[PDB]
Design a binder for this molecule. Structure first.
Ligand SMILES: C[As](C)(=O)[O-]
Ligand SMILES: C[As](C)(=O)[O-]
Ligand SMILES: [Zn+2]
Ligand SMILES: [Zn+2]
Ligand SMILES: [Zn+2]
Ligand SMILES: [Zn+2]
Lengths: 313, 311
């Protein structure tokens, strides 16, 4: 009712504060970080870079991030816990499945996947006792039969535990509509779902209609455009349509990445030196200078994630 | 000296060695994330220890676990079951058929570094070093599979550690593998072409053997006619290529990389497990006139010569 699971344990809704709802410490693959830490220089080097990054973000106001790295994205909650403590920033961990499931996941039934998700939420991830506070799902534009199983399992897990669902989409294909239909067929409330990567489109009609059904709209990759201004104005556009309370904002940034061709991390960093501090240091002043009240911005960056993450129903 | 999950052993300690086996056929990260799939980690461990003791009591002294990173290799489990069962286990590097994005997008130079790491330094943070390099291909060999082939050759050439392959024998896939590996300067004597018992094309096997490749007749119980597959062993013996033969079960004690409950299907079909080769195939070969010295050469001498790091 009033508590969410983080990598350091349970915390009250009040303690969450300014929350970036879609971020990554490391974008990788299952087992990869521990098998090949050298790829990131070293595990310590990666940990240190994250801590410095998170500390700057904290200096700029951020108090909580939701790491939406799944099993198949190389989620290492021990790394999350280590960097969360050193930086003193809350990190919410995720279960669910992204776009790279191995055979041992691809060949599972919806009932089996439901059990895996429940495990990571109710018991803990691996042997850590760290519990997931959100369920991530990724689909291609047209939802594949396996991705539909993952969607349904996520809905059933969410209905059993109250933790929310966040999605990866192709907004240019308007992927969120196919997902929503499947999720609702399972009896899941739109208020428990964030349709992610929605800032990668100019289709306001698509965005508003989803918001009007109660869905959280993930405008979560603003600096990837580094234009980034156009993405930010979608936040304004949705406010002006009256859907302030359905907006979630993030950077979708990373401190390490192996699930892409080599050297991309340095290109990203030089493209966006602010890292996860891009939202508080760049997007928020931009929105102020456009006439959005400070109180509406606080509602979006604090109150909305609070409402979204609190286990419900 | 051969690297095992318990440390280095001399080639004489190896003894009766099964050169293609698995403790568990899974996926990277899977065993630690979802141990309940196998009942529990403890349940999986205990089954494997019983099975390895069964094989030990049948003469086996060493198995080669050719589970790679993407087959969900957990060398801490291997070390645990090896100690409990007093059976040597050789661990593998390389890549099987389910590489994740973080592997699929790597260059050959990068893959070479990863394989070298697991051979020279250790696997994960355990200090356990790989003693063999596994590689799997399909069809005519995909572009990425070529990269793994070449990275494996380069790792082998720098360390002396052998290369063992997964192949579609029905497609004569060993020929393309051989071509690529030889282009890298790798000697065929450092290479086992595996799953070669899944064909009837004897001339395919003979031609590879004649070039110096080890022939992995490693899936005999996966037929159980297994008697027909066993006759391939005698066929190569009769052609004077006893030196080129490796035999194994390719068995597992837990499987997650397939449909649920496939493990139970497999166990009821082959209740002997990894003891299938010594309890069924070896006596069957004696009946057909194969002398004990020849059988000892296949099960002891050949794997020792294969696994011993050689330049
Ligand atoms: C690293 As992503 C696919 O969540 O933008
Ligand atoms: C794990 As297999 C069937 O390729 O030996
Ligand atoms: Zn995404
Ligand atoms: Zn992301
Ligand atoms: Zn194989
Ligand atoms: Zn195998």
């Amino acid at each position: 009712g009033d508590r969410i699971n983080t990598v350091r344990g349970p915390i009250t809704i009040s303690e969450a504060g300014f929350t970036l709802t879609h971020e990554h410490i490391c974008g990788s693959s299952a087992g990869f970080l521990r098998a090949w830490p050298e790829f990131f220089g070293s595990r310590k080097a990666l940990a240190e870079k994250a801590v410095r990054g998170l500390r700057r973000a904290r200096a700029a106001g951020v108090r909580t991030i939701v790491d939406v790295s799944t099993f198949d994205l190389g989620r290492d909650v021990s790394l999350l816990a280590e960097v969360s403590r050193a930086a003193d920033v809350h990190i919410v961990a995720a279960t669910g499945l992204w776009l790279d499931p191995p055979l041992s996941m691809r060949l599972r039934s919806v009932e089996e996947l439901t059990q895996f998700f429940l495990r990571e939420i109710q018991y803990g991830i691996e042997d850590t006792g760290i519990r997931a506070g959100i369920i991530k799902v990724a689909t291609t534009g047209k939802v594949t039969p396996f991705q539909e199983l993952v969607l349904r399992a996520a809905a059933r897990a969410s209905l059993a535990t109250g933790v929310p669902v966040t999605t990866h989409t192709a907004a240019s294909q308007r992927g969120g509509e196919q997902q929503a239909a499947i999720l609702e067929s399972e009896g899941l409330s739109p208020s428990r779902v964030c349709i992610g990567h929605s800032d990668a489109t100019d289709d306001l009609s698509y965005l508003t209609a989803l918001a009007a059904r109660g869905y959280l709209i993930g405008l979560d990759s603003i600096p990837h455009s580094a234009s980034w201004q156009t993405r930010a104005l979608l936040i304004k556009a949705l406010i002006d349509q009256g859907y302030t309370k359905q907006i979630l904002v993030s950077n979708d940034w990373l401190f390490g990445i192996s699930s892409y061709v080599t050297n991309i991390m340095d290109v990203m960093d030089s493209g966006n030196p602010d890292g996860m501090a891009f939202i508080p240091l760049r997007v928020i002043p931009f929105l102020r200078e456009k006439g959005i009240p400070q109180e509406t911005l606080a509602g979006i960056t604090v109150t909305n994630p609070a409402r979204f993450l609190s286990p419900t129903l």
